[PDB]
């Protein structure tokens, strides 16, 4: 039957995950630069992590 | 010194006394740096919320002293102008004129050159209205004055400057001052009226040269 050949039964994607690029999110963040300390540390010579 | 805000219409017109340069014994080496230091002292007087960050000099010989006298404010932008605006028309109106001339003390007289047009229309078209009024009063004084009152029944309040008109009267007096401006220009600039597009009408009221 052509209603099955259409590929019938009206759909409503509520809650169901959608097919493709619909889910596209993108966040532009840039954190503060975590530099290391060299002068007046009291610590041993190589850097801390 | 005419310090005109386009957006807020707050005209800071500083009175410069005759005694500042009647006995000064100086060249323009005092004059340029003196008008620059006094407009900088106006900037130092106002709070930081009311200080500008963009200053436009009409006459090109002032941005170089303004660079020197405003190094306390590197946040501000001092550009020149290709369009010159006739603020000697402010001198020609009797209120500012005899205000300036009768003032025996140099002072920092405030004005709002848009009277209360900011409750009615934009600040852009209020600026275009003000520069239509000022340029049309520059091309002819009393002709533009009697155009500025379409009836002799209208009055301006003593706290206002320009006569209180509403939108219909303002648009009709605006097209009257506009073709007065173009008629004086085409009388002087050798070329007719109808050969100019509205960009050219715009930069003729604005003061640029085509």
């Amino acid at each position: 039957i052509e209603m099955m050949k259409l590929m019938a039964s009206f759909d409503s994607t509520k809650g169901k995950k959608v097919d493709g690029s619909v889910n596209a999110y993108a966040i532009n963040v840039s954190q503060k630069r975590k530099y290391r300390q060299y002068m007046n540390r009291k610590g041993g010579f190589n850097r801390p992590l | 010194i005419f310090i005109f805000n386009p957006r807020t219409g707050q005209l800071f017109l500083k009175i410069i006394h005759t005694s500042v340069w009647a006995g000064q014994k100086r060249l323009g080496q005092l004059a340029k740096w003196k008008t620059a230091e006094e407009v900088a002292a106006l900037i130092r007087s106002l709070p930081v919320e009311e200080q500008p960050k963009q200053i436009i000099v009409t006459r090109k010989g002032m941005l170089d002293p303004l660079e020197v006298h405003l190094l306390d404010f590197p946040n501000i932008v001092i550009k020149g102008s290709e369009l010159q605006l006739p603020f000697q028309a402010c001198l020609k109106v009797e209120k500012f004129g005899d205000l300036i001339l009768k003032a025996t003390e140099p002072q920092m007289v405030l004005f709002n050159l848009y009277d209360d047009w900011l409750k009615t229309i934009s600040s852009y078209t209020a600026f275009s209205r003000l520069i239509l009024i000022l340029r049309a009063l520059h091309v002819n004084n009393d002709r533009a004055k009697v155009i500025l009152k379409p009836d002799k029944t209208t009055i301006t309040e003593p706290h206002h400057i320009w006569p209180t008109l509403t939108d219909e009267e303002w648009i009709k007096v605006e097209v009257q001052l506009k073709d007065l401006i173009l008629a004086d220009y085409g009388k002087k600039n050798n070329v007719n009226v109808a050969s100019l597009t509205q960009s050219e009408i715009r930069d003729i009221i604005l003061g640029m040269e085509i």
Partner: protein, 100 residues
């Protein structure tokens, strides 16, 4: 002179443009952004990005007074850019040349 026309977007673009507010490798484009920010998210001047780097380098930041001046400067920018004409009109209507 352009109104933001109801049922229309393009007049707002003509308004904002007028107001000037505008080995077998992978095979790809690495869009390197190198950006300096403080904790608030503000894009950082290279002089003060170097100042943050050098505070973290030397381990000794500013004093109290320079931090007072710097913090009060940042909220001066915040109070300025979040915005006496009406007060001038009300003082003129009380009597036109408010001479300072």
């Amino acid at each position: 002179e352009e109104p933001i026309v109801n049922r229309g977007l393009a007049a707002a673009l003509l308004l904002c443009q007028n107001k000037g507010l505008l080995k077998e490798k992978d095979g790809y484009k690495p869009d390197v952004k190198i950006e300096y920010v403080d904790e608030t998210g503000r894009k950082l001047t290279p002089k003060e990005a170097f100042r943050q780097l050098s505070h973290r380098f030397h381990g000794k930041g500013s004093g109290k007074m320079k931090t007072e001046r710097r913090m009060k400067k940042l909220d001066e920018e915040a109070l300025l850019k979040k915005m006496l004409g009406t007060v001038a009109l009300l003082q003129e209507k009380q009597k036109p040349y408010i001479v300072l």
